[model samples]
Target chain A: GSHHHHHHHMLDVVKGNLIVSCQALSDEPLHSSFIMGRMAIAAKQGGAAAIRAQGVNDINEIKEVTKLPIIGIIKRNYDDSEIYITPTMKEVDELLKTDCEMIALDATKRKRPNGENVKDLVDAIHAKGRLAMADISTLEEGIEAEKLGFDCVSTTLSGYTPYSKQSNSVDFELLEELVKTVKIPVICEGRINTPEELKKALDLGAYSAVVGGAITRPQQITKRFTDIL
Target chain B: GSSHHHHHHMLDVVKGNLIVSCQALSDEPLHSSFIMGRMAIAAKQGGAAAIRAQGVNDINEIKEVTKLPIIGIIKRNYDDSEIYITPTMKEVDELLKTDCEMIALDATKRKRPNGENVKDLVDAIHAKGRLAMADISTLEEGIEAEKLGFDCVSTTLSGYTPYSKQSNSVDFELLEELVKTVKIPVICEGRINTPEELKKALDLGAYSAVVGGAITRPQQITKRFTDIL
Candidate 1:
């Protein structure tokens, strides 16, 4: 119950603000931990409310530099599972070593690499004194995440999964439905590429918005223009 | 005269295409040379016509990875000067070693750190068999850059100089005016922060558009959202 109160307090701090996801995979450019720390500092200077980061090393680095609360995830691929974002307890334990306030896990209907249930992951996050953010694809998954005791849900995986619908633009229809259906906070994320989309998402009742590639990935943003030409 | 013809040939390749400026200063995050190289690769994949990069090291790295023509500059701050982007002959000499097709220099009326003339820098570039791009602040500066023998001029420093007019949005008026006045190609740069601005710049008759912070700097893009909030 004490942890629950803390989660709500953190949520309130981020309400109506932009939380930047400053992540770079191992194979991608901007992959150094120190670089991510600097990126977070720049984001802080630019008025980001909080940060969404990947990996324990980056979380530690970002924590060292910025005071903004972090939402952490570990992206690791397994030969057995399609669910890679904070996929197991191992990743969660790693995140616990850092100062991240929230842990985002894949909350889709797909099977986990370790066959762990979504409820167990949420329970672990709560037991460890951190909030859980369910990265879901559909409205149904968002509702299930809330029922499983997740603190909040995000449309982060709206177009990434094979079973989910793909979109070049923000999934406003899914965000609208999730806000209508879920009792927990619905964070609008994934493909909210433009300022207009960010405004529309907030107007549609999102608790806060998490913008990743549109803000951090230079390659992806460049493609948006090049494809038009 | 053949050098002039060569400059025109290079200009033809970049006309009507987006040129992404992938740069990160030493104090800022995303400052590594290799990381910038990967960013250029991504920009190329996305359809950028060319790359406007900073530093000779970054230009060398970008050239090694991508086939795109580069517009290079060296940003060095001097205690005695307000001009930073390729402010002196020393910077131009270093850029001459790279495979960059165009060298961008500060073309404002302000005195340079080394007390070098803009005409000397343009002559030096032409002597080295490279094209010169004048990074100008105002309508008059754009026209003056053309008179000074620059192969092209860009509104790259429009609002950056203390005496120049500043705006949060793209300066369409300045772009339009430059297009009408300058015989040399008027490349649009600075604060063109959206796809709409990119389109408008081309429609206004810019030879090409160079988008920097919107497409490359994640920190700046995040601010665009947080500022509105």
Candidate 2:
């Protein structure tokens, strides 16, 4: 049953060249729901099939503005740890109140905000029948998130593994391994900014993809031009 | 006549609720011209008033895809100087060769590449019949760039100013001062990601605002989110 639904959805949105999304962290003092909403509208107009956005305001605004599928998250700082992105059930609850189509939770093998386990969060998302996209950083974590029954797998956190062995980006070698090993459709995310990288990921048979910054970030935009001689 | 024309062009592009742009760098090696071109198309589709794009490949690609006014720049690394963005006439000449509408040279009052005065570069751009937008980091730099005959002044480099001392963002104090002092219109460019900040810049009397990352820089997008979590 899981394979059946995921397969059909994948065939529809994950075929040919797909647009991986780059959503902003709404908690940023600079951004708000209205701005994020405007961003989502822009992405859709640009031919984005789906969007990855943050915060309640962003989700609400994007949902109201476009028909594209949204992978939603909330950035909440925890005192004891640096966990963000739907760190607890509280975030999920809040996101559900918005028009977000999917709730992306931190699927790193690391313990959750209040010591919640992957199974618990997965069950909650499933109970609501809302799809869940796993944001994993490493091969081991990807395999584990799959085992925990995530609806889909994404390399959103490929660089921030607790081991900190590699630079922060979607290392395709690990992605290849995940593609070879996992049954679930793999969504290539993380640092896939250019069409070349996205094409490479699709060539590797990634079920779908998301691309952000080359499309929506300003600090990085200014830096790219400023850092050169 | 040159000064009037440049100022008029800058004013035309800078007065908008939203300015579209591209973030062409990445912590990962995924960004390139093709990707930036697609982003430029996307930005134009989203109603970007102008585009801020990086060096050769990406800038050319953006030019190929869209007619949106481009804030052209070249990022070259040098051991002797940290200045980038049309650091010399060579880069300015390269930018002029493309369909880019304006050339933004570093106006930070810092030492230039090969010890050349920045005023010469501004003169060269004006001589070419293209607009010159000075990317200044401080109030004094804004005033100086204006006196040196730059067509317009932008707060794009506010982060690297001696007073700000931060990366990936700008200090509002410098922006405020620039708005307060410069006779020419101030194009607020750097570190603006939120609507609130955009509003603040406008309220402070900035001529127009350019935003990119929340719309384009995907590498930093994933990195910032993962690191925070």
Candidate 3:
């Protein structure tokens, strides 16, 4: 019964709405969990439907400030692993301590540090009563994520992987292919830098859209303008 | 002869290139001269032509790290004045100590705190062997700034004043009107939140554009995305 309620709640909150990703790595200037909580509050005041945050500490702090459903991940890079976003189940265990309604794991074809499969990660998240979001780079990965039974698939890793098509703009073709192939919700994310791109993603039938650096990272936004000159 | 050389130098560096405004106020996060200097360096690496920075110390610090021409302003609020962007000669005096190629002054018709005229401020900036940029709110104010012999007129205050049109988007009509009336180069600024808007501004024949919050302020960029939801 709780699973049914959680499923509906996720869909209700994010359908056709903007989910802001508020994250800052330890090396970044605005790396404090306290600042991230304030950033979430600001995003809420501006009408965000939900928040996507990184790490257990930030999730806990953000949960204290906002009741908005969170899609959470942990960005930990092991020397042997290229799959950093929730690379292992240990990161999933950490995220479960917070009130994040969904967990995002790397669904790329890259090998895991401990040789654990993506299936195990999704199953662990599901067993903990949270939905799983697959962050995929290619259309083949999106298909594989759906086969692994992720609650949703997002084009979050589209341009980040060396094997994926590198683009400075939103990967509309990948979004379109995933939307056509995936039976579950297809989320548009990564490099949707402008409002027009956001609208275009929605028009292309993405279940929801997440914009990270364009909204939450000032360093990146400044670079977008600078690059044009 | 030196003044003419400085004037042409300022225009040449910024005429067709994007000028990133890297600033953070005392009450805001990331508000240090050191951090701003680093931000300027990042913007320079990203191909920014010039930088519009706030405060004397930030300008000095930024100049140390980047050879890019700087457009400097001081944002100090006085209890009696609505003109906060480089409001008085005292602020201008502070900016003159730095090697800013241009100084931006509030050219709105509102009364200044020290009862100083805009004409005097323009003359003072010229006397320092730097170019003067007028941050005006309305078309009339842009015309007046041109008449006062400002090196350039910008629609920087277009929607900030009570009398100006309040908008969430760039005021293209005011930009059009200012461009039609003024003999000086008309800069498009304020509420240009997207690359499309930047393109539109340039297509309308703005001499250049200044994007601050959209590019430099993380908090503001996050709010812009969240507000659309």
For residues A187-208, write the lDDT of model 2, one tens digit per residue: 8876764456676877787887
In the range B1-229, model 1's lDDT, one tens digit per residue, is: 4523444456898899999998988866678888788778878877888999999889999999996899999989899989998988899899998889899999999999868889999999999788999999999898889999999999988888877887877878899999988788999998878787788899899999998888877778888888777
Clashing residue pairs, backbone N/CA/C < 3 A, model 3: none
For all predictions in the order shown, the interface RMSD in Å is 1.9, 13.7, 3.4
Docking class of 2: incorrect
TM-score leaderboard ranking: 1, 3, 2
| Per-prediction TM-score to the true structure, in the order listed | 0.88, 0.52, 0.79
**Per-residue alpha-carbon lDDT of candidate 2 for residues B78-118, written as tens digits (9 for 90 to 100):** 66678876788778888888877788888887888888889
List the global CA lDDT of all models: 0.87, 0.69, 0.85
Tell me the number of clashing residue pairs for each predicted model.
Answer: 0, 32, 0
lDDT of 1 by residue, A31-136 (tens): 7787688778878877888999999889999999897899999999988899999998888888888888899999999899867777777888889788999999
lDDT by residue for model 3 over A1-229, one digit each (tens)?
4534334587678999988898989766557687677667767766778899998889988888878889999999899888899999899899888889999999999899889899999999989878999999999999999999999999999999998999988999999998888899999999888777888899899999998877666667666765554
- Residue A80's lDDT within candidate 2 is 59
**Against the true structure, whose lDDT is highest?**
1
DockQ of each: 0.58, 0.05, 0.29
